[PDB]
Amino acid sequence: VRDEVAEKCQKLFLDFLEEFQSSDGEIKYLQLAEELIRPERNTLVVSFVDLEQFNQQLSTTIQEEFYRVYPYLCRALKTFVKDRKEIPLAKDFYVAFQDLPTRHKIRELTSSRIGLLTRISGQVVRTHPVHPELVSGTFLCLDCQTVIRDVEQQFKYTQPNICRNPVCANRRRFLLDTNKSRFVDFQKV
């Protein structure tokens, strides 16, 4: 039930990343690759209006479940390269949209609506440098337990207390999973 919808939303996102308009073929794909990789600007755009025309229920689903679609757009979407060599080097992606004709008033953007969309409008106040505090990761040993896609997220530690050989934490330790982490770049304004 949830599996089929999670697959089909990703499918209807991926197939639409290539436009039917703007001529045809794979010359445009090469041009976009040249415009992206060569300067490493990481700037892409897709018309949300056409996406809504194709499936308006998609715009409602993303609107009500940004908190649910962010982690799948993070991992599964990266399949556009079709090259196994470039997938491990890549850490994060960048996409955007310009001249959006749909917006909501901030006065109607009440705090009671967490998980919807909002427009970044206002005054820049209180700039902050980037600090690399611990965000997400894991230290679990592979000889003891296998990796599940449910751990940490925020600063909290492991809840389960099974196989208490390394679980005993009454001793300082600095083993940081620098190989497996969500650390790219981040700041608050």
Next chain:
Amino acid sequence: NQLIRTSGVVTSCTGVLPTIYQNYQRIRIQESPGKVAAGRLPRSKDAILLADLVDSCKPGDEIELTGIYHNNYDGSLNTANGFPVFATVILANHVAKKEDVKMITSLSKDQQIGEKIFASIAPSIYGHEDIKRGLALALFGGHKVRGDINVLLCGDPGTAKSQFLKYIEKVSSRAIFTTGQGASAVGLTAYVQRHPVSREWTLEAGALVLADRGVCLIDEFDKMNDQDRTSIHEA
């Protein structure tokens, strides 16, 4: 989390400076050189010496730095300061211890271009005959075979005459504008600030060190603070 190849120059040593903090010391390192394309301000490197390369590093070594940038931010206890945008702890792993040039060189010896060369030296404003002499001497910059050049101008700041020195950076390789008080980081002058319980006192690295056997340009010299004058007078 990738091995990175880069270059850098050791600027200073911290033998002259005075237990968790004692394990390491602080050094000021830059990577971007002076260039027209480098006009946008880059992210400065701050390297940490973990008592391994101390006293073994000497100024003037055009060396290459290679390593991996792990973001093992030791400040998780929130009792110190932090690194700029390139938020990562930088470890040191490589310090050495011990063409169009040719085509132009062929034209350099040529006397046909050697005649009009001193009749095109100052095309921007054509200035005054004395200024060109000072500029030409500055361009060449010439055991104890040393020397200093004091070029003086007599105008006013409102006219671009004050900004005439801005055009030198197009030709000069190392030009930094001080503007007087509140220059970029260290403006060749040493200063002391009050520090919290656990932070490192600052070893002031001027552009004087960064242009060893080079050329350093100073603007608005007489607008500096009276306090800075006392320290800089001796050096």
